[PDB]
């Protein structure tokens, strides 16, 4: 089938690459990277995202592999020394699918989050209203909001103090960015975590521009009415060759390895 | 159908329950609180976790009802001037159910918990070492460890920084109580989340006596060779009569009603 | 003596300010704004601080007074009912004396905060080593470092898991914004407290731009070598007439008024 | 001059003890357990304490040193191989002193803490009245209460979220311990650092007994009216020997060594 290799760009990526490639021309593997069923990252975690991204619009027919080069990553979690191995059972697997997050953005775009997507003020105080489910919960002042992916709890919003939950579950977390609490403004604090459905709105108080960041983009939108996050109804497929469980992916990369 | 009613004792609580026994008697409905289909709590959350482990072994059988004289509850979330109009529409609904947590304890025991379990230690100092899917995922030195469900994470859970979850979601969450984190041991810190089947295992390393909880009960086990969680296959049934979101319910608790 | 009011500009604060200035006309007061000796801000707690780094040359000769014309402040303490006597007793009073942070920015420029100094980066990714008296310390990654006065502690400080310091005791907080914590970067996570004379020194790993805040101005600086932070010699002055306890005003600001 | 040498119990320390006996021979040093002007710790932070509370009658007579047999201490700084080294130095030093902590149980008994104090309910809920200098500051309601002195902050203190605080400040920290926090009980959250002369005091709500703890003595005291914390004026005095700053031994103990 047609399958494409994407690069962090330094010395090992890009020899690894070229010996894969090499690799898969001794089967009946044909390089495309407009229409291909696989996608290989060699690099880190954010190679992937990248690679997430360039085919966000064919996600339904990829497959995705993650290789890293430099530390374990959580999505790229497969070393150097299997690629050999890797080409070959390629060349004749199983599907794992994580789910993903919907950002919309009124003034509408839409974007695809397979970490997280955050919303920070344009320059002055960050103030707005949190919505669920077309009910208002909450009116928030502070640095920022983050809503993470189940696979993306283990990034930015393990930093803001989230739960870490295990991909199978279709969920979306929101965390707050140093919320302030006194007698005035009142913020909920706790992480929250949303099932599928569920969707949380939030709606600009006085100032309308929002710097909306979207996995590595980020992007200063302006006159923003309302952004919206649910959990998609899309989701990205890993190709899956052997057991590596999320839970000692965590314990490798958080306890040691 | 069957009935009964508790009380949480005070006045307030037991002239509402012979007010609806009264009304009830209105209705073909007979008081039984040895086989009742109907429980109603009338009184805080600490009543309605009262009436749930009195009935744990028909849960099946049973439409769950809290009404709170005191302050909002998450399982009492209904007000006494409802009562009249409870009782006529109980008497001709819909229903809803929440995940439950499993404890089991070996030496073997097990347990039903509503909200949450945690383990502390008898006397001297804590130390567990923590396994997830039969794997060895960290060894925990600190106060103690909490299991909770997804109606329980506004409880205990909230307190200890863990995320509130929808419980629509059948999960549970594990959070920790000061843990010690320096170059010798090493926690992961984050509250975990955990799906359906995940066993979390809790395997003792030198002292074998733990306090364990289950909501309100407590009690000091002794030769505990294991302790071991998962969702439970059981779920607690509500009686259903009007919306009241989950969210509004944490809304109305926390930020102000 | 000569004194002069600054005013947050709405409607309730000028005219607070005019008929001060009127009650201070009774009596042998002369307004100036060059060479003050007593500086009252009406409006809230920004006003305040706008009206300290308005005459931050001229510390060691001002006594500072703050009237909230809104919700209670930490430097504007004292409402507006209280104007009368103010003016009456700052004709004829005891002065008291918070600690001050000195940043030094070097290329060198130096900046006197309030409340605190924050550090983010200009566009990508917030990489500084932490020098803590001449010794490496850790390397930070993240979205910022806060560093805070002790009357600081209850602003940015709080919302980021600071502690509150009572102002009597010389010294300065730093403080984390979402540090990464796995097997490659390790920060404390802790807050950290210094006291006098100590210094705290940022400097840069790649990225050598930064957005620096000092209360509310904020620069981006680029081409920085280093961020010297250290409790300064120089004192603010309050004008005292009663006693308002800092933990009083605590209680008042976040328990319940 | 007198002094006497306490140990961990295991082999290493032992005869390490007994090596350093030995030594000390060589020179004018006279071994007495009742009234040393040196006392030596050799094992760990908490063969340290117990050599604390042992001459806690004399403190103002004694200079303490700490050797770590095993990790790197905070009290217990000195590797085994520093220890002819130690004996050299003593025969013929400066000293340096750290805070401490009194608490004082009225039902009245006083102690003294290097570490910390603590406060826990007896079986039942824990709730207790917390008053800073006469002025009821909130209700707490949560598991307990940990007041910490400087040198204590990176024990306790720190894994219940404190700052971390350079023992040179004299002050105390009071950190909560999974307090509730809703529509009802309100607590600040935050840390608390005071300074000398300030007199923070628990005072019973409903239950009247408490498992109070000071370092590592825990006792279960009956009919407590009241608990009282304030900087003790008394300090414990170390030998010092060479530069090895607080800093470094917060950086080597959680960072890396
Ligand atoms: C760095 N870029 C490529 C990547 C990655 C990655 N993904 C994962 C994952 N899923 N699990 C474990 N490690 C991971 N690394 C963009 C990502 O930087 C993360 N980020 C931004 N600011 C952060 C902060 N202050 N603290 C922690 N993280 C932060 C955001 O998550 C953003 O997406
Ligand atoms: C009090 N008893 C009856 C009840 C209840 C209740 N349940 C909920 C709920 N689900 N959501 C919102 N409020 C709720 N209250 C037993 C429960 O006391 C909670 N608990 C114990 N120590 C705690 C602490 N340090 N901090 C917060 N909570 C603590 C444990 O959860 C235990 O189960
Ligand atoms: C708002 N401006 C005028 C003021 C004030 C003020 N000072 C105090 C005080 N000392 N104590 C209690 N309340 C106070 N309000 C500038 C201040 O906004 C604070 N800030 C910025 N971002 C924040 C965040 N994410 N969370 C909490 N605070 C934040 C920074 O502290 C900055 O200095
Ligand atoms: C263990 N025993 C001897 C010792 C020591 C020690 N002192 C220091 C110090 N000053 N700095 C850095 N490490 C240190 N270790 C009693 C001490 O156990 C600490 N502790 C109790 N429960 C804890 C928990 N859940 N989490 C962290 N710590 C806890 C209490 O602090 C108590 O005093």
């Given at each position: 089938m047609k399958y494409?290799?994407?690069?962090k760009?330094?010395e090992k990526?890009?020899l690894?690459?070229?010996?894969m490639?090499?690799?898969?021309?001794?089967?009946?593997?044909?390089?495309?990277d407009?229409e291909?069923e696989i996608?290989?990252?060699?690099?880190?975690?954010?190679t992937?995202?990248?690679?997430?991204?360039?085919?966000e619009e064919?996600l339904?027919?990829?497959?995705?592999?993650?290789?890293?080069?430099?530390?374990?990553?959580?999505?790229?979690?497969?070393r150097?020394?299997?690629?050999?191995?890797?080409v070959?059972?390629?060349?004749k697997?199983?599907?794992?699918?994580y789910p993903?997050?919907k950002?919309?953005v009124?003034?509408?775009?839409?974007?695809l989050?397979?970490?997280?997507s955050?919303?920070?003020?344009?320059?002055g105080?960050?103030?707005?209203?949190?919505?669920?489910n077309?009910?208002?919960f909450?009116?928030?002042?502070?640095?920022?909001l983050?809503?993470?992916?189940?696979?993306?709890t283990?990034?930015?919003?393990?930093s803001?103090?989230?739960?870490?939950?295990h991909?199978?579950?279709?969920?979306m977390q929101?965390?707050?960015?140093?919320?302030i609490?006194?007698?005035?403004?009142?913020?909920?604090g706790?992480?929250?975590?949303?099932?599928?459905?569920?969707v949380?709105?939030?709606?600009p108080?006085?100032?309308?521009?929002?710097?909306?960041?979207?996995?590595?983009?980020?992007?200063?939108?302006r006159?923003?009415?309302?952004?919206?996050y649910?959990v998609?109804?899309?989701?990205?497929?890993?190709?899956?060759?052997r057991?590596?469980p999320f839970?000692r992916?965590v314990?490798?990369?958080?306890?040691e390895?």
């Amino acid at each position: 089938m047609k399958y494409m290799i994407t690069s962090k760009g330094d010395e090992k990526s890009d020899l690894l690459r070229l010996n894969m490639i090499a690799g898969f021309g001794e089967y009946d593997m044909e390089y495309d990277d407009v229409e291909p069923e696989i996608v290989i990252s060699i690099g880190g975690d954010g190679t992937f995202l990248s690679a997430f991204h360039q085919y966000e619009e064919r996600l339904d027919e990829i497959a995705f592999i993650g290789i890293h080069t430099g530390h374990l990553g959580f999505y790229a979690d497969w070393r150097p020394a299997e690629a050999d191995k890797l080409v070959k059972l390629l060349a004749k697997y199983q599907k794992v699918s994580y789910p993903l997050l919907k950002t919309t953005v009124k003034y509408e775009a839409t974007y695809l989050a397979l970490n997280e997507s955050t919303v920070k003020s344009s320059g002055g105080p960050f103030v707005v209203d949190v919505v669920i489910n077309d009910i208002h919960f909450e009116r928030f002042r502070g640095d920022g909001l983050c809503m993470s992916t189940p696979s993306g709890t283990t990034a930015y919003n393990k930093s803001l103090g989230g739960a870490l939950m295990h991909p199978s579950i279709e969920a979306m977390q929101l965390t707050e960015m140093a919320s302030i609490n006194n007698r005035v403004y009142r913020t909920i604090g706790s992480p929250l975590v949303f099932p599928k459905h569920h969707v949380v709105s939030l709606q600009p108080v006085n100032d309308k521009d929002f710097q909306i960041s979207v996995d590595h983009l980020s992007i200063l939108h302006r006159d923003v009415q309302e952004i919206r996050y649910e959990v998609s109804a899309k989701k990205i497929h890993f190709a899956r060759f052997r057991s590596f469980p999320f839970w000692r992916r965590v314990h490798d990369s958080f306890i040691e390895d």
